[PDB]
């Protein structure tokens, strides 16, 4: 795959201040730090699900956020689940940096072995200084409590341990985190529970609920997240 490869380096030449010299120094270097391949986490049946989730999130962090400007694992959101799980397995074998959407697919692959754990996508559209921003994490529910797995450029926009007692509290935590950096939350897209069958021929339903956070208002926003939580016990 040389075409893709030189795309990445040609794209770096543009975006980095000193684009060309940077490629020169790395591509011409004979000795590079060998990066250890991260070990895929596997769990004893005695390990509680919350400790498993901490290990899944640590593995996702280990791959690191992809700052190169070139995505190594393209994701067609309309692919069947068994197609996306094939791709998650190859992320496991290639072990390259990733972004938010790839981490959601990785999070599902790594939690299919936890049938008592409910997984569902939550994507956000936020506004700031004339620009729109899209982000997505993997919502999770364990024993009646809510949390999240993900990959983000910000520490408070990814991992939440499953401690929130309602979905509303989980989502409002994200809004507060967005607010601390002056982002307005415009829209929340919530999907349905993801099947634990890695061979399922169905798509992820990314848009079971779309909430207009400005057109809804505070309490109607809360009632809407709760209707969605009730509908995941479908």
């Amino acid at each position: 795959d040389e075409a893709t490869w030189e795309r990445m380096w040609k794209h770096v030449a543009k975006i980095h201040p000193d684009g060309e010299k940077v490629a020169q120094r790395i591509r011409g270097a004979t000795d590079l730090p060998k990066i250890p391949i991260p070990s895929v986490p596997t769990f004893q049946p005695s390990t509680p699900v919350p400790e498993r989730l901490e290990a899944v999130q640590r593995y996702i962090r280990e791959l690191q956020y992809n700052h190169t400007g070139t995505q190594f694992f393209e994701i067609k959101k309309s692919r069947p689940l068994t197609g996306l799980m094939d791709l998650a397995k190859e992320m496991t074998k290639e072990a390259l940096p990733i972004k938010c959407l790839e981490a959601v697919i990785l999070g599902i692959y790594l939690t299919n072995s936890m049938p008592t754990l409910e997984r569902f996508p939550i994507s956000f559209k936020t506004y700031f200084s004339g620009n729109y921003f899209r982000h997505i994490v993997l919502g999770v529910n364990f024993a009646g409590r809510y949390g999240a797995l993900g990959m983000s450029r910000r520490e408070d926009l990814m991992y939440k341990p499953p401690a929130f007692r309602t979905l509303s509290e989980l989502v409002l935590d994200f809004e507060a985190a967005y607010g601390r950096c002056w982002h307005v939350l415009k829209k929340v897209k919530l999907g349905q529970s993801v099947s634990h069958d890695p061979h399922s021929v169905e798509q992820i339903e990314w848009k079971h609920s779309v909430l207009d956070v400005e057109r809804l208002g505070r309490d109607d926003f809360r009632k809407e997240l709760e209707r969605h939580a009730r509908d995941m016990r479908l």
Partner: peptide, 22 residues
């Protein structure tokens, strides 16, 4: 395995580049 010594070098370069870009 000609594939694998090449994937390892590409990977080492990607993480070197990823580190610079942070």
């Amino acid at each position: 395995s000609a594939q694998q010594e090449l994937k390892q070098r590409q990977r080492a370069e990607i993480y070197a580049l990823n580190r610079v870009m942070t």
